[PDB]
Design a protein around this ligand. Structure first.
Ligand code: NAP
Ligand code: Q19
Length: 157
C-alpha cells in the first residue's frame, strides 16, 4: 500500500518556515499510531525540519544530494525508487513530495486542521469526486489540543 499522510488546514496550508504552523499533540499520536512499524518517505527539507529519524519505522529521505548518508535513515534519489520499498509506505511530505505523489497513491490519511494559518507551503487541491471517505473522525479537544481537527481516511475511487 502506498498512502499519503498529511495534516492540512482549511486552505490546505501544511507548513510555514520549515515547520508545521500549529501545535497539536493528538496529530503526532495519530502519525505514531499509523506509521509505527511501517515506512515514511519524506523530502530533504522535511527531514531537516525534524532533524533525526522518527523512532520505530523505516525513515527514507528523497534528495538529489549524493553526499547524504545519515545514521538511521535510508536515502533515495528518485521518485521511482519509492515503488521498490516493501510493506506499507507513507508519503510523509513536504509540499514537493505531496505534489509528486498525490496522483500515484492508493489512499490518504489527512488530518484536517479546522483553522486558517499563515503558510508558505500547501497540499495540492483535490476533490471528493475522486476520493471516497472511508472514515471521518472528529479529534478530541482539551488542554493540550485546542484546535479542532478531523481525521479523514480517503480512498481513491
Ligand atoms: N503538515 C504536514 O503534514 C507536513 C508534512 C511534511 C512537511 N510539511 C512542511 O512542508 C514544508 C516542506 O516542504 P517542501 O516542499 O519545501 O520540501 P520537502 O518536500 O520536504 O523537500 C523538498 C526536497 O526534497 C527533495 N526532492 C523532492 N523530490 C525529489 C525528486 N524527485 N528527486 C530528488 N529529490 C527530490 C529535494 O531535496 P534536495 O534539494 O536536497 O535535492 C527537494 O529540495 C515544511 O514547511 C514542512 O514543515 C508539512
Ligand atoms: C517531532 C515530530 O514527530 C514532528 C514534529 C513536527 C511535525 C511533525 C509532522 C506531523 C505530521 N502530521 C501528519 N498528519 N502528517 C505528516 N505527514 C506529518 C509530518 C510531520 C513531519 C512531526
Amino acid at each position: 500500500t502506498l498512502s499519503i499522510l498529511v495534516a492540512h488546514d482549511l486552505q490546505r496550508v501544511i507548513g510555514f518556515e520549515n515547520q508545521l504552523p500549529w501545535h497539536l499533540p493528538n496529530d503526532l499520536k495519530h502519525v505514531k499510531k499509523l506509521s509505527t512499524g511501517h515506512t515514511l518517505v519524506m523530502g530533504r527539507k522535511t527531514f531537516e525540519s525534524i532533524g533525526k529519524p522518527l523512532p520505530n519505522r523505516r525513515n527514507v529521505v528523497l534528495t538529489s544530494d549524493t553526499s547524504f548518508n545519515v545514521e538511521g535513515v535510508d536515502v533515495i534519489h528518485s521518485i521511482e525508487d519509492i515503488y521498490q520499498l516493501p510493506g506499507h509506505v507513507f508519503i510523509f511530505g513536504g509540499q514537493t513530495l505531496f505534489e509528486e505523489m498525490i496522483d500515484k497513491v492508493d489512499d490518504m490519511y489527512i488530518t484536517v486542521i479546522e483553522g486558517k494559518f499563515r503558510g508558505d507551503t500547501f497540499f495540492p487541491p483535490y476533490t471528493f469526486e475522486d476520493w471516497e471517505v472511508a472514515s471521518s473522525v472528529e479529534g478530541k479537544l482539551d488542554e493540550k489540543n485546542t484546535i479542532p481537527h478531523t481525521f479523514l481516511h480517503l480512498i481513491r475511487k
